């Protein structure tokens, strides 16, 4: 008078009345709000207007180490990101985070009485997305001879609850870091078509702009950079000469100038030796 | 080449402030666990066992609800990893109420609502077990499936608690039958369908399990009661956290009325003589 069911299905159903296992992995990783700078034509770069987001996003960082490089006036740690809201941010990713020394803050003090921390950072993105919106044009319009293409990481600003203060993040490249040109206006011989590019990218940022910005102090891995100097090349401002935060060398557009060696690059670009007169 | 003043303006402009209002995150990020099912694709033969990786989600709140034993508030999930729930999709959060924690403080040592939420959720997924095999079994000549939502469970920081987490169903929310055996009088095809599973379930299980307090949308079913028909004691009567009467089944027996499913299915009359 019926088809009941079988030992299998019996004990899958007695089972869930009585408690089952669960062992929740622990809890690892720190919450912080993430804010981007937007963008509104995304597509066209160069002729985008940038502006900050206002509703901040979720995001976890694992603060796997203690290890903090560099010896400017900031300094990078590593940390993994185990969630970003919209993933804004790669999962299992590692990511570096970058803050100003308590020194370079009470100097900006003077200049930036409130906030400091986050101005500085607000500057530094800024910057770099300045950079970025240059490779951009320099891509699209660079001859199709030239199989190279600068290309800056995207920066985002970061607000951590737990250690009470802003960080600038961006994506942690693996591989040689390395500098092309510096702060002082030098710049390395090139050893190959990489590097020229690098280096013909910052003599061309000069020539495009018409001689208002140049952007110096090319490194990071390969085609990939970062924290370069987009310098107001006639500002006399104390603190206004660089987007971001830099110690510029002695008249060091005067120097690059003066030390820059044109490359089959710069020529394949068409553009004109620095040495030549401004204004004759 | 071509260095335009839109172009030269949207640099410069970088070199300034650019006004910067940081506004705190909207809604609250939580953490969601599945019980998840060793055969899916055949429900009913398949092994539930918790997951054990954590995966974020971010939820909005909306509005709210409540019933007997449970406070419930609609919100939307925006996003989530790995798509643990749905994005853009509305769900309805629930925690139980103060008198319920504080009937099982006794049975739960530590972590009782923790344990309150794994019941429920449990109790849910043998009903859709039961569902499942039910729409495998029953005749061609009946239509519709019923069907019990998947609950989730749900750690949220903000609030410090845990919580279950289930799709939120639009439509007319009505109940088919309660745990004191009451039953709606079938007015179409479907309400019929659905009085005729809870005395399948009896018979199904040999008269050791009945699934009660069958409510929902359409043939979309949660909150359910499933009872031991057998146990002479309501402590150890059903599954998860339910308010039951120790007359429940034989209360059910008595008054349920089969109709044409009840028969299409063959069901034998629940107040015959269990040793016939
Ligand atoms: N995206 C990155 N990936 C991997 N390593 C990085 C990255 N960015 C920076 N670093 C490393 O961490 C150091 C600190 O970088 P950074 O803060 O930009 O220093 P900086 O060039 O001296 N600038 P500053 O701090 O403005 O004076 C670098 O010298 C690198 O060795
Ligand atoms: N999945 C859902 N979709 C839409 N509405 C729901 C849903 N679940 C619950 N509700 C509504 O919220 C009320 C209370 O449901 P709920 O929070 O699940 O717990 P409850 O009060 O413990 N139920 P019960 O155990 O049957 O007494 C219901 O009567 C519905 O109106
Ligand atoms: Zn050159
Ligand atoms: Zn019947």
């Not at 960082?61 to 970003?84: D, P, Q």
């Not at 020194?103 to 910057?127: A, F, G, P």
Request: net charge neutral.
């Amino acid at each position: 008078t019926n088809y009941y069911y079988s030992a299998v299905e019996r004990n899958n159903l007695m089972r869930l009345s009585q408690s089952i296992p669960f062992v929740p992995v622990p809890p690892r990783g720190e919450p912080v709000t993430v804010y981007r700078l937007e963008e509104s034509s995304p597509s066209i770069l160069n002729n985008s207007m940038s502006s900050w987001s206002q509703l901040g996003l979720c995001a976890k960082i694992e603060f796997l180490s203690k290890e903090e490089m560099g010896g400017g006036l900031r300094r990078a740690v590593k940390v993994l990101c185990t969630w970003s809201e919209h993933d804004i941010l790669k999962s299992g990713h590692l990511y570096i985070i970058k803050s100003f020394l308590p020194e370079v803050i009470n100097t900006w003090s003077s200049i930036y009485k409130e906030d400091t921390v986050l101005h500085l950072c607000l500057r530094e993105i800024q910057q770099q997305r300045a950079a970025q919106k240059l490779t951009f044009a320099f891509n699209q319009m660079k001859p199709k001879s030239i199989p190279y293409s600068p290309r800056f990481l995207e920066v985002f600003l970061l607000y951590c609850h737990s250690a009470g203060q802003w960080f600038a993040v961006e994506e942690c490249m693996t591989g040689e870091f390395r500098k092309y040109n510096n702060n002082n206006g030098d710049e390395i011989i090139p050893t190959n078509t990489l590097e020229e590019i690098m280096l013909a990218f910052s003599h061309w940022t000069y020539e495009y702009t018409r001689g208002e910005l140049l952007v110096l102090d090319l490194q990071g891995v390969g085609e990939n950079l970062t924290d370069p100097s987009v310098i107001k090349a006639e500002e006399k401002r104390s603190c206004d000469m660089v987007f971001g935060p830099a110690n510029l060398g002695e008249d060091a557009i005067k120097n690059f100038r003066a030390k820059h060696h044109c490359n089959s690059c710069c020529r394949k670009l068409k553009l004109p030796d620095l040495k030549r007169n401004d204004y004759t």
